[PDB]
Write a protein that binds this DNA or RNA. Structure first.
Lengths: 136, 131, 143, 94, 38, 141
RNA sequence: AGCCAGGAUGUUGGCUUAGAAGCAGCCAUCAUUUAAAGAAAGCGUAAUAGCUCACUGGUCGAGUCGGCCUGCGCGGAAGA
């Protein structure tokens, strides 16, 4: 579970997510798992996806995780009436805009990558799609 | 395998062999085996040597498309699991009778030996010739 | 014991940046005090030693071979390393020192264990029984 | 070798832009040198295929328009966020 | 036999088959591979 | 003239088929005759140089008249002989160790010529060089 | 796509293992006869053997195969 190392605050407004990805292009490896969906990846989801990905590809092949949570999610303690101040910071999430590159891979064959990313997508909530580094 | 390139090139090999070949022989393993082949083709290798090369491809649209130019008498060999074999290394060879004897001797058969024509011999061992 | 070029008995101290065993033979560096500094034959650190003073160095062998360090490497953890415990018993030489290094930069699970050997042969089978376990992606003498 | 047919655009702007991009054809532009920057509409499919070749982003392209076989070097392209399709291209006139 | 919402070929012999609309996976090899639904 | 029954090709000692794997139930599951096999094999291979695991093919007859078919001791063994190596490598072509001489192998490829595939000793010599690949050996002229 | 045959030899390759011979592990990933046969893709034996495959030839003889982009549906889908 990746977690922000001490933020400026402790709680953040719910906000929204009316947008598109910025890191749309694959940055490092010649492989990436672009997220087609529009969601909120929990640290758990990300770390788990990494595990499965990694497991599949053995220790060979470098991997990057383009996303990072940095969005504290508060929630009320089960069974408490609305109000009485904002809830406790249950966990952390990372907002995902359609077309957001998630994980990137390199040093391994396209086929294996395709499979690892398949498993990653499986673990992940939002729908994704396989991609390859673009030549400019 | 690729295409017309190798096909036509193997055909060049064909012309090569017929260019100075004598009584080319027909070849068609019915139920022979590779273990036998180890000393089989090796034996052709003991005959003339690099001579026998059973490039199976008696396809009427393939090797047969490559046939015409030399010893067109070869066509007759078109349908079913058959092939070709010449006699470039052998003007007036005894190479043909070798196939008869073996036709009934450990090889099941090889198109039952009939060949084509240079010393005027279809299904006929080239008997009347100095060894 | 160690036939330092035609004579044994000579006080020496084994190097601690390498693990010499009765194999490649050993280069012998003469320290100020503590007599001889066996550093195994052929080693980078050994290289700098020669670099500054070749004259005070002569070879050595084994005459008539114990204690060594090994770096086994495992997959993260969640328990199968406990599997390694089970192996602790099967290992003949008493483990001398546990030293896991799971740190580095990733989820790597290396362990610098220190033990001993009675004969190079026996060592062979050592690596064998280490290579068998799937979680033991790596197992080699640390230097 | 990357020869490409293309039409002159006559409706620059986001509206027609998307209106066109929906029509399996997308806007892109040729510019560079003292020559006047030129809005260029062009078929999506063909180029979608051409780009697969890395040379498409190195080899001098030969866009054709009204008989004008202008040669241009590939400069930049705005791919869609996720849908495997082009949205816009930047042909440095060469 | 399995009754998954996600049937898939399990071996070389596994074969997808749409009986009366219900999708199925009959398999000449291991009977266990037989599964329905999806 | 029998062809199929107990005809399998098995490496066996040129004149010492006594252990279990070389003889024992290795031909026992196939049911082969230790007895006469010894008598004749020994009786004739005593003239043959001993100690090298030459390949042999058991050929059974209808009333059990066996024909062991020895070829020529293993190229790997010939490599141990002429090269003077006692062992190849745990890492074939990753750590070549046994020193070799081309002509030695060529003449040894002539013995193997005596029994191989084709006609040219040299092509068979390449097979022996291929054997050297199989075990990880340094080549030397 | 079916149907015929063959699918090896050197040599059971080496380290290794009682045995690793195609098939415990690791390396090698060559040669040969080749139409084709990988020191082997699945199965199989204590290892073998053996079953099969890739591959190649025969016949038939017209397209067939694998992905992508989208329209519309199917399954997923049980409550008093």
């Amino acid at each position: 579970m990746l977690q922000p190392k001490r933020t400026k605050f402790r709680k953040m407004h719910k906000g929204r997510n009316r947008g598109l990805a910025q890191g749309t292009d694959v940055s490092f490896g010649s492989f990436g798992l672009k997220a087609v969906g529009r969601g909120r990846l929990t640290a758990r989801q990300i770390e788990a996806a990494r595990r499965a990905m990694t497991r599949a590809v053995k220790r060979q092949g470098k991997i990057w995780i383009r996303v990072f949570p940095d969005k504290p999610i508060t929630e009320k303690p089960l069974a408490v009436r609305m109000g009485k101040g904002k809830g406790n910071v249950e966990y952390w999430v990372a907002l995902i805009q359609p077309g957001k590159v998630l994980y990137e891979m390199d040093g391994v064959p396209e086929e294996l990558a395709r499979e690892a990313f398949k498993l990653a997508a499986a673990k992940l909530p939002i729908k994704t799609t396989f991609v390859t580094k673009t030549v400019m | 395998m690729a295409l017309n390139l190798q096909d036509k090139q193997a055909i060049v090999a064909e012309v090569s062999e017929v260019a100075k070949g004598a009584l080319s022989a027909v070849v068609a393993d019915s139920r022979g085996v590779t273990v036998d082949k180890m000393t089989e083709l090796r034996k052709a290798g003991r005959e003339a040597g690099v001579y026998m090369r059973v490039v199976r491809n008696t396809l009427l649209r393939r090797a047969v498309e490559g046939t015409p130019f030399e010893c067109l008498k070869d066509a007759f060999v078109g349908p079913t699991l058959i092939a070709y074999s010449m006699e470039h290394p052998g003007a007036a060879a005894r190479l043909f009778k070798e196939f008869a004897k073996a036709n009934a001797k450990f090889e099941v058969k090889a198109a039952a030996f009939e060949g084509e024509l240079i010393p005027a011999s279809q299904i006929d061992r080239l008997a009347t010739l100095p060894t | 014991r160690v036939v330092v070029e035609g004579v044994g008995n000579l006080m020496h101290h084994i190097a601690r940046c390498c693990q010499p065993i009765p194999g490649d033979e050993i280069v012998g560096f003469i320290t100020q005090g503590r007599g001889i500094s066996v550093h195994r034959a052929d080693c980078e650190q050994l290289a700098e030693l020669r670099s500054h003073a070749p004259e005070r160095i002569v070879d050595a062998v084994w005459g008539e071979g114990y204690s060594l360090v090994v770096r086994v490497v495992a997959n993260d953890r969640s328990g199968l390393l406990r599997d390694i415990t089970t192996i602790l018993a099967n290992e003949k030489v008493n483990v001398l020192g546990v030293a896991s290094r799971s740190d580095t930069k990733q989820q790597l699970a290396t362990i610098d264990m220190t033990i001993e050997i009675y004969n190079l042969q026996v060592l062979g089978r050592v690596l064998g029984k280490l290579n068998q376990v799937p979680d033991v992606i790596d197992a080699r003498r640390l230097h | 070798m990357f020869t490409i047919n293309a039409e002159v655009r006559k409706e620059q702007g986001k509206g027609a832009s998307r209106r066109l991009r929906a029509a399996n054809k997308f806007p892109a532009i040729i510019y560079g040198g003292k020559e006047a920057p030129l809005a260029i509409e062009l078929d999506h499919d063909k180029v979608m295929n051409m780009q697969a070749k890395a040379e498409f982003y190195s080899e001098v392209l030969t866009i054709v328009v009204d008989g004008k076989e202008i040669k241009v070097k590939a400069q930049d392209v705005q791919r869609h966020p996720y849908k495997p399709k082009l949205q816009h291209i930047d042909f440095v006139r060469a | 036999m399995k009754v998954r919402a996600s049937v898939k070929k399990l071996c070389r012999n596994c074969k997808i088959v749409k009986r009366d609309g219900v999708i199925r996976v009959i398999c000449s090899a291991e009977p266990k591979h037989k599964q329905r639904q999806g | 003239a029998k062809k199929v029954q107990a005809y399998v090709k098995l490496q066996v000692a040129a004149g010492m088929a006594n252990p279990s794997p070389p003889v024992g139930p290795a031909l026992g599951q196939q049911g082969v005759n230790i007895m006469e096999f010894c008598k004749a094999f020994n009786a004739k291979t005593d003239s043959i140089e001993k100690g090298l695991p030459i390949p042999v093919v058991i050929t059974v007859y209808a009333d059990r008249s066996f024909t062991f078919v020895t070829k020529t001791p293993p190229a790997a063994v010939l490599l141990k002989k002429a090269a003077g190596i006692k062992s190849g490598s745990g890492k074939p072509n990753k750590d070549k160790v046994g020193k070799i001489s081309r002509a030695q192998l060529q003449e040894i490829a002539q013995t193997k010529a005596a029994d191989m595939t084709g006609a040219d000793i040299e092509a068979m010599t390449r097979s022996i060089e291929g054997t050297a690949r199989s075990m990880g050996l340094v080549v030397e002229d």
